[PDB]
Amino acid sequence: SGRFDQYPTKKGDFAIDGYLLDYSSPKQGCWVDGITVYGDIYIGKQNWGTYTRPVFAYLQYVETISIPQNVTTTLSYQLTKGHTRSFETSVNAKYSVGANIDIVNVGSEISTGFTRSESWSTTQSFTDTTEMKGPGTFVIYQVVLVYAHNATSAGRQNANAFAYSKTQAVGSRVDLYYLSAITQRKRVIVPSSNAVTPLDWDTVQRNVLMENYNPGSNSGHFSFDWSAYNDPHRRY
Ligand SMILES: [Hg+2]
Ligand SMILES: [Hg+2]
Numbered sequence: 304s305g306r307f308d309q310y311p312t313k314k315g316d317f318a319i320d321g322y323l324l325d326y327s328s329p330k331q332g333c334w335v336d337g338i339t340v341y342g343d344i345y346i347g348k349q350n351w352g353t354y355t356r357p358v359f360a361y362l363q364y365v366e367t368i369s370i371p372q373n374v375t376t377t378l379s380y381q382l383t384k385g386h387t388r389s390f391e392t393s394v395n396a397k398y399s400v401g402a403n404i405d406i407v408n409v410g411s412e413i414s415t416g417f418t419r420s421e422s423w424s425t426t427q428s429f430t431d432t433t434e435m436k437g438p439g440t441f442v443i444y445q446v447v448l449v450y451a452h453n454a455t456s457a458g459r460q461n462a463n464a465f466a467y468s469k470t471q472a473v474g475s476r477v478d479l480y481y482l483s484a485i486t487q488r489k490r491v492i493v494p495s496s497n498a499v500t501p502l503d504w505d506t507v508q509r510n511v512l513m514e515n516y517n518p519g520s521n522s523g524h525f526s527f528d529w530s531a532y533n534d535p536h537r538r539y
């Protein structure tokens with residue numbers, strides 16, 4: 304399907320909830336209107352001054368379950384916190400970010416629902432439960448928050464750090480553009496009849512960064528707000 308122009312744009316958790324609570328048609332994801340912040344991100348061998356903004360949110364597959372007629376059960380399933388399993392498996396270089404980057408979420412009216420030390424850390428699995436009743440086949444998904452980054456000057460040394468990236472020259476400096484993803488403490492359960500094939504990390508990066516963002520003009524479906532550098536409230 305691709306064609307990410309089909310997805311709407313939402314600002315903050317109330318708007319994302321509005322999108323997900325509209326059961327009139329199956330939902331896969333949305334572009335996110337969020338603020339840009341500036342601060343350190345460790346990539347490869349050092350910290351780089353990085354611009355970060357939220358850009359997309361999507362539902363990533365957890366599991367499918369079929370329950371017979373007259374059966375009520377407490378279903379246990381694994382959700383994750385911190386960076387997504389797909390993001391973690393896709394990165395080639397040493398990668399880490401301090402907890403204070405979360406000002407990007409606060410300023411964008413998004414909350415991860417996880418602790419300060421958990422939200423931007425390594426992938427950590429946890430058990431979640433829902434009492435469910437049959438008959439039916441149901442698919443469980445977890446909300447993924449996607450961010451675009453410009454790690455300034457990182458492009459000469461880290462051009463192969465990520466599965467998908469773009470470098471851009473600024474005078475004699477080389478910037479590194481890439482996406483990252485973390486989870487939110489939010490999961491959706493839908494009958495197999497109200498379900499479509501969910502988006503995955505490879506598809507999201509190809510469409511959002513490679514096809515829909517142009518570092519050359521800082522345009523496409525989103526733009527970074529460079530004024531973050533000059534705003535103390537958006538520096539972490
Ligand atoms: Hg969404
Ligand atoms: Hg997001």
Ligand SMILES: [Zn+2]
Pocket residue numbers: 336337338
């Ligand atoms: Zn905005």
Ligand SMILES: [Zn+2]
Pocket residue numbers: 534536537
């Ligand atoms: Zn401000």
